[PDB]
Paper text:
Among them, BD-812 and BD-836 are superpotent, neutralizing the SARS-CoV-2 B.1.351 pseudovirus at the near-pM or pM level. The two superpotent mAbs, BD-812 and BD-836, bind to the right and left shoulders of RBD in a non-interfering manner, and bury 788 Å2 and 799 Å2 surface areas on RBD, respectively. Notably, the epitope of BD-812 involves neither Leu452 nor Thr478. Leu452 is not targeted by BD-836 either, whereas Thr478 interacts with an acid residue in the CDRH3 of BD-836 (Asp108). Due to the presence of this negatively charged residue in BD-836, the T478K mutation did not adversely affect its activity. BD-812 and BD-836 would both clash with ACE2. Therefore, BD-812 and BD-836 belong to class 2 and 1 RBD-neutralizing antibodies, respectively.
The SARS-CoV-2 spike protein recognizes the host angiotensin-converting enzyme 2 (ACE2) via its receptor-binding domain (RBD) to mediate viral entry into the cells. Together, these cryo-EM structures provide detailed structural information for eight SARS-CoV-2 B.1.351 neutralizing antibodies.
Author numbering:
A (entry chain L): 1 to 106
B (entry chain H): 2 to 117
C (entry chain A): 334 to 516
D (entry chain M): 2 to 121
E (entry chain N): 2 to 108
């Protein structure tokens, strides 16, 4: 399989701060990493396609970056709306594995 | 596409289960449905994928011999079929669909399974 | 009286290259404008006819052969080519008079974890005669010792799956190919 | 027709060796490449074999989980990926392929590459 | 299949016949048994196929007869050139298994 290891499980930042969440893959996946956001109660929401492309309806605050082994989701000035958990999925190859969680609390 | 699921389930460890998910009238043959599992507190896990139009099913190694995934095209519903359950299956199950690349754009509400 | 071309190019599924589908077109009014004046076709290459001149000619039969191959193997769909497809799956005559239309169909025929519905022949004792195909699934005999139906050394299965995946490179991504031959 | 292996790959325990055999002259699409192992002063030990055409690999059960085998038919070669090396894998590795010229293989593994000494 | 080579070590002279008897546990699938010669330093070279059919370029001094479980390799004019370790193999549906080598010894 392909193993995904993420950033620290817990991140805390102030409102308006810039937040980075990075995850790395065991093998080499070209750019096929999606980024999902799951609010504490709601269903997870897909944010980012192959790391760069956003999703319709997502504010342009979120930004994807990286390639090969390491990928990164970055958030500009924060709001209380973004206190969710963030997962990075690799959809290269078979078993599309998920990373860990990146809890964010203001 | 919209995805509506069956509902909350309460079973016993030896019981077997059937979990349903409806489709909103797909148009392409490359219309896959993935089932993902989120145990309480733990993160999302990708169980398996199915293509109803040709009914081709792929499983993750973890859930190869444990679960089964079927899809009745006529009534337009996919099912996660559980054999004799375990206490380790008290999770939230999501029926998802998305792009042909395998990314999970569309999510249905969660089915809450509890066994005692 | 338009032609069944809508039921060929816009077909749901295409046959495997080793068992390519053939459909006959006759007693029909053919409109090749809808084909050439379409940007969906990555490869649109005609031999012996001009794409614009096509509407100005009449033929007694038009054979549409449909199948699915890889991106790298599109080159082999041409008169006078050598390769797996040309030698063992689909051979075109050197005096070919017709067109070849191939377009990338990754978002149709490639599926997560591998599409194993599409197969191609690996081995054959002799190359294929032009426009001739065999759907035989008998265990290929590579050496002298009789196989007796036991796969193993020199007893290879003749068919191999493409295993199409949506994350493959453009070379290995599936391409749907329709070959129009005029007679 | 000939077949040449890689060079010696003396490594440390726990590493992984990617031993390569490159073949010339064959119609390699029909050939099969078997991989065998022989310690110093010991008997030959079969590892596995590869059907290059179908690319179907059969391993020995002892080596089933540890080792994988691939082809890369474009370069007409054959690769053996051996995982974490226990101290026993201090042996000479050999490829064997038959005369498969002209889409017709010749029974028997006659063509053998010069061995590669791998030390753990 | 777990093969073996009965003659152990041959302590012979380069004048007499050398017999290499190879015994399996089960049988073999048709003509898939094969013999190999490995000189002390050289990579093994293929000699024989299922029953008697010697490989190309093999000198005529090498011959062998056998079917089923039992197999045999014969050397008529044993030579200093022919002093090596001879190995069995089967290509059956089982994982292919060699045999414990037989060393031919001078005098």
């Amino acid at each position: 399989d392909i193993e995904i290891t993420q950033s620290p499980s817990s991140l805390s930042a102030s409102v308006g701060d810039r937040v980075t969440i990075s995850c790395r893959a065991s093998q080499d996946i070209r750019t096929y990493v999606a980024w999902y956001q799951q609010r504490p109660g709601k269903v997870p929401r897909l944010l980012i396609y192959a790391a760069s492309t956003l999703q319709s309806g997502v504010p342009s605050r979120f930004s994807g970056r990286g390639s090969g082994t390491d990928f990164t989701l970055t958030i500009s000035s924060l709001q209380p709306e973004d206190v969710a958990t963030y997962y990075c999925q690799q959809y290269n190859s078979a078993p599309l594995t998920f990373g860990g969680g990146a809890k964010v609390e203001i | 596409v919209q995805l509506v699921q069956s509902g909350a389930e309460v079973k016993k460890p030896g019981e077997s289960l059937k979990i349903s998910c409806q489709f909103s009238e797909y148009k392409l043959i490359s219309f896959w449905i993935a089932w993902v599992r989120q145990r309480p507190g733990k993160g999302l896990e990708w169980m398996g994928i199915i293509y109803p139009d040709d009914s081709d099913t792929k499983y993750s190694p973890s859930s190869q011999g444990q679960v089964t995934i079927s899809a009745d095209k006529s009534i337009r519903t996919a099912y996660l079929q559980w054999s004799s359950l375990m206490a380790s299956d008290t999770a939230m199950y999501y029926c998802t669909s998305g792009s042909y690349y395998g990314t999970l754009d569309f999510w249905g509400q969660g089915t809450l399974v509890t066994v005692s | 009286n338009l032609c069944p071309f809508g039921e060929v190019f816009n077909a749901t599924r295409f046959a495997s290259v080793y068992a390519w589908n053939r459909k006959r077109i006759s007693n029909c009014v053919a409109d090749y404008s809808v084909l050439y004046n379409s940007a969906s076709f990555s490869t649109f290459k005609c031999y012996g006819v001009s794409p614009t001149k096509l509407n100005d000619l009449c033929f007694t039969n038009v054979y549409a052969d449909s199948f699915v191959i890889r991106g790298d193997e599109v080159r082999q769909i041409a008169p006078g080519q050598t390769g797996n497809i040309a030698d063992y799956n689909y051979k075109l005559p050197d005096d070919f008079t017709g067109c070849v239309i191939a377009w990338n169909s990754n978002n149709l025929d490639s599926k997560v974890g591998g599409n194993y519905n599409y197969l191609y022949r690996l081995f054959r004792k002799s190359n294929l005669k032009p426009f001739e195909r065999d759907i035989s699934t008998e265990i290929y005999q590579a050496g002298s010792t009789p196989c007796n139906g036991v796969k193993g050394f020199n007893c290879y299965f003749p068919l191999q799956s493409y295993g199409f995946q949506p994350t493959y490179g453009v070379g290995y991504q599936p391409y749907r190919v329709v070959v129009l031959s005029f007679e």
